[PDB]
Ligand SMILES: Nc1ncnc2c1ncn2[C@@H]1O[C@H](COP(=O)(O)OC(=O)CCCC[C@@H]2SC[C@@H]3NC(=O)N[C@@H]32)[C@@H](O)[C@H]1O
């Protein structure tokens with residue numbers, strides 16, 4: 001219905017209290033039976049709504065679906081984001097964000113339940129199943145030189161890792177520059193992009209894909225031995241709204257640090273959060289492949305690497321395989 | 323008409339020969355009187371078309387209007403550009419290009435007769451009068467690191483300056499990093515932007531605005547003492563199609579050099595093409611202003627400056643006033 005999101009937003013706003021169907025009807029200026037039909041439909045999609053005679057309706061639990069009405073409350077109370085766009089299915093939130101940022105200076109995020117053309121680094125396929133992960137692009141407006149893109153990427157990683165760690169009983173680690181792991185399984189990839197010129201960044205677009213509720217059978221093919229979801233490491237049901245709220249909080253925290261601190265302030269905590277040390281790594285550089293060991297992360301965020309031939313490299317980015 | 327661009331493209335294709343109305347009618351599968359009406363309308367907009375009984379029509383001259391039908395011939399025979407978009411009026415070709423490049427790897431350009439929201443560096447107003455200049459954005463796909471943006475900007479300047487110089491009896495000079503001058507008048511501003519991440523450039527967007535046919539009375543306000551058009555320096559009528567063709571050629575030439583040569587190969591020719599030397603310059607850095615002298619352009623394209631206090635600076639970009 002036209003009014004399903006409005007009814008949902010009133011339910012959400014009123015937690016922990018019940019609201020009457022009559023009160024929702026007066027807010028939206030619709031009949032009481034139209035309100036009943038909307039609530040019957042929301043319950044059908046998987047909202048747990050407790051309805052008690054003479055008292056009204058309490059939203060108790062939301063399904064694994066993004067609702068614009070609820071996300072609207074997340075943005076209303078945000079000091080970072082002006083708005084959000086929520087979709088059931090789209091080609092890519094990253095493409096959507098790149099189009100939406102043009103001609104304005106808004107900060108915003110895009111969420112979609114599904115992507116049909118999700119891409120990672122190097123334009124690799126990113127699997128984005130309906131109702132099973134968080135597929136998001138975040139647009140921000142830092143007043144910084146374009147070379148700061150690498151620094152951003154280091155701060156945001158810790159914010160993502162912290163959010164995931166809150167829901168996982170297992171050790172969550174960063175794999176520089178762009179992956180989050182739990183044990184031997186990738187739970188998240190994120191991709192930082194920019195629109196920039198010589199005078200500065202016009203926008204940062206951070207694409208973030210986090211596996212939330214896949215069982216291993218849901219991972220399909222042979223990323224399976226290499227992939228994991230938060231639910232596989234959580235004894236409790238993972239609630240996507242609880243998670244999103246925690247994630248938005250850590251992103252804002254880490255984004256304020258990016259704006260105000262040198263990377264050297266964060267560098268030790270980043271080292272201790274990393275799973276790249278004391279192991280042989282496979283680097284790919286265009287058509288070249290070589291093995292090496294990561295020996296340090298310098299004060300400017302460059303990986304210091306000693307290859308199998310004994311030669312040192314100082315790398316702003318790489319693609320690393322375990 | 324639906325067919326005006328098609329008729330125009332056939333006329334253009336057939337130069338220097340006349341084509342009959344009957345032959346245009348058979349190509350487009352329309353009546354002979356529909357062809358006559360299209361030609362009558364094109365003549366009304368300012369096309370000079372010579373019509374002779376029994377023989378047909380020759381396009382002799384186009385007006386100061388961009389026609390998609392003609393621009394289509396420029397792209398068909400291009401080794402650089404896959405397509406173009408031509409508009410009579412748009413907010414900005416730069417905004418249009420930023421939207422159009424998303425989700426593809428095409429190389430292309432956008433032209434508009436007018437812009438209602440033309441912007442330069444720092445989001446300054448760029449005046450874009452209907453029928454008086456070339457207002458263009460070019461999208462290219464160099465396979466390079468994001469830090470190469472500054473180098474691109476140095477090569478393209480010489481290509482623009484060369485094209486303008488061909489139509490001007492006066493000395494055309496580059497004002498680093500982003501302006502082209504004839505004497506004391508700015509004839510052109512260009513703006514290089516990119517979409518990039520740590521793995522490379524996804525697109526370069528070069529916004530190029532060249533004043534073609536303004537009289538001084540057309541410049542309005544008090545940019546007048548500081549602004550000029552190519553026509554004010556040309557004894558001949560300036561033909562925008564001739565100019566565009568020359569400009570596209572020099573851009574491709576200079577873009578191939580960017581891909582294959584170090585800036586040190588071009589550096590002396592850039593110095594000799596510049597009007598910034600042996601004069602006091604005003605620099606603006608955020609809220610700071612200072613005077614200085616440009617003393618050299620280094621091998622990486624950095625301006626070397628000695629300020630009024632005697633201190634040296636090495637600058638990748640600046641905003642300079644005379
Ligand atoms: N759902 C998944 N979970 C764990 N691994 C996956 C996966 N789908 C694909 N993979 C594997 O991990 C690699 C991903 O490549 P990279 O390391 O280049 O690239 C990345 O790690 C980052 C992906 C960013 C995805 C988000 S989803 C929201 C936004 N919209 C987009 O379209 N993109 C962003 C693949 O080559 C696969 O082996």
Ligand SMILES: Nc1ncnc2c1ncn2[C@@H]1O[C@H](COP(=O)(O)OC(=O)CCCC[C@@H]2SC[C@@H]3NC(=O)N[C@@H]32)[C@@H](O)[C@H]1O
Nearest residue numbers: 414416440441442443446448449457458511512529530531
């Ligand atoms: N038509 C004009 N001719 C000469 N000067 C002008 C002018 N309009 C404005 N100006 C002056 O020059 C300055 C322009 O600022 P900058 O130096 O920051 O910035 C530039 O020099 C570059 C402009 C790029 C314009 C093109 S037109 C096609 C494409 N689409 C766009 O929207 N933009 C690009 C202004 O502050 C004015 O003083």
